[PDB]
Amino acid sequence: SSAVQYFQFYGYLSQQQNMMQDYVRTGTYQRAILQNHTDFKDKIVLDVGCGSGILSFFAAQAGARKIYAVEASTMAQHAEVLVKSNNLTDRIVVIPGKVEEVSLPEQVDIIISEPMGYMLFNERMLESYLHAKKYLKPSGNMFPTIGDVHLAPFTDEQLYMEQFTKANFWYQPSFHGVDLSALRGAAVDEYFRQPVVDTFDIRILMAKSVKYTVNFLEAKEGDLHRIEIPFKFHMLHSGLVHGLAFWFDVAFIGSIMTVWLSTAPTEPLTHWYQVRCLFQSPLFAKAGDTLSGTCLLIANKRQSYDISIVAQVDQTGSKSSNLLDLKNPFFRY
Numbered sequence: 001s002s003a004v005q006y007f008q009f010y011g012y013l014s015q016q017q018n019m020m021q022d023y024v025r026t027g028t029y030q031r032a033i034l035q036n037h038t039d040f041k042d043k044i045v046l047d048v049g050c051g052s053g054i055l056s057f058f059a060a061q062a063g064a065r066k067i068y069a070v071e072a073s074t075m076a077q078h079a080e081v082l083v084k085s086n087n088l089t090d091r092i093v094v095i096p097g098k099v100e101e102v103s104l105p106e107q108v109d110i111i112i113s114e115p116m117g118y119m120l121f122n123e124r125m126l127e128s129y130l131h132a133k134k135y136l137k138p139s140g141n142m143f144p145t146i147g148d149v150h151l152a153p154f155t156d157e158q159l160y161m162e163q164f165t166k167a168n169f170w171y172q173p174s175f176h177g178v179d180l181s182a183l184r185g186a187a188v189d190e191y192f193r194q195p196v197v198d199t200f201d202i203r204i205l206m207a208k209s210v211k212y213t214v215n216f217l218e219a220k221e222g223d224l225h226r227i228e229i230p231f232k233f234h235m236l237h238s239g240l241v242h243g244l245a246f247w248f249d250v251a252f253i254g255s256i257m258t259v260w261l262s263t264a265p266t267e268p269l270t271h272w273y274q275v276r277c278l279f280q281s282p283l284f285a286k287a288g289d290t291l292s293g294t295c296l297l298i299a300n301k302r303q304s305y306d307i308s309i310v311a312q313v314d315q316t317g318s319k320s321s322n323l324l325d326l327k328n329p330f331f332r333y
Ligand SMILES: CNCCNCc1cccc(-c2nc(Nc3ccccc3)c(C)c(-c3c(C)noc3C)n2)c1
Pocket: 006, 009, 019, 114, 115, 116, 117, 118, 122, 123, 125, 271, 272, 273, 303, 327, 328, 329, 331
């Protein structure tokens, strides 16, 4: 139902084009595959959620002997057209359906995919990627191999105030004669439930990031149903902490070289941008204080996660929580 919409979203060539036009994304995948040609020459490769098939062609440019491209949306029909018109019907085989349901005729030497949603984990496609390892030969590789999530406290008073400014629409005792003000708190709540997807100046960050690593070769599908990310930040600056910023890097660890794709705010912008989660109430922290807590991600049935963030300044005991709905963010860009 929710999944109906998820796969229809990816049936649009315009959504494929948005990702293809991300040059950092598309070019880094090309370079990771090509410059690791020994991982692909004459190999059998599985492309999980191939969309238009761009990754499958990159594996063919690298010399792969057979490429199974699995795609569940109507986009599979468009990739088929592309395979024929590029004369690769020998080397690339499009398989319509979910990776969890299709039948592959052999095991593969390497799995390739672009399974990262914003904040990495949205869409829960990492689980389909991990599930595909049931087709991975022993000692096969995964491209990408590693994913690092980073989180860091930020201060951004204008972003925080923007929330009450939008919800104060409801604080009118006479909107065309109607008292709206009893909904103001519900409206505040609704805005704070949304992660804020856009980029930002790195001068809002107040501590070195915490890194949480998922190893795609080692992880199991079940390991992503619940992601506990403890953190303890040593605050490099004093200020009001308004929430946590998130970005992610992935690594393609090939035989020839390791290529990184970063969505860090210190790196060229990508179509993933970065993600920020506001706290209920900001926390005052001195430089030298430690800010500790947990960011808990609980998979849900809308192909996404409920996000629970609890934090406290250890030196004073002031704490804040928040609960966010990652499926429904504010695309502030
Ligand atoms: C698996 N590799 C995906 C790589 N791209 C990740 C990515 C990066 C940046 C943004 C989105 C994004 N944009 C959406 N609309 C939209 C955003 C801005 C302007 C106009 C429309 C939606 C609806 C979703 C989405 C999906 C899918 N499922 O739930 C949700 C929510 N995601 C996705």
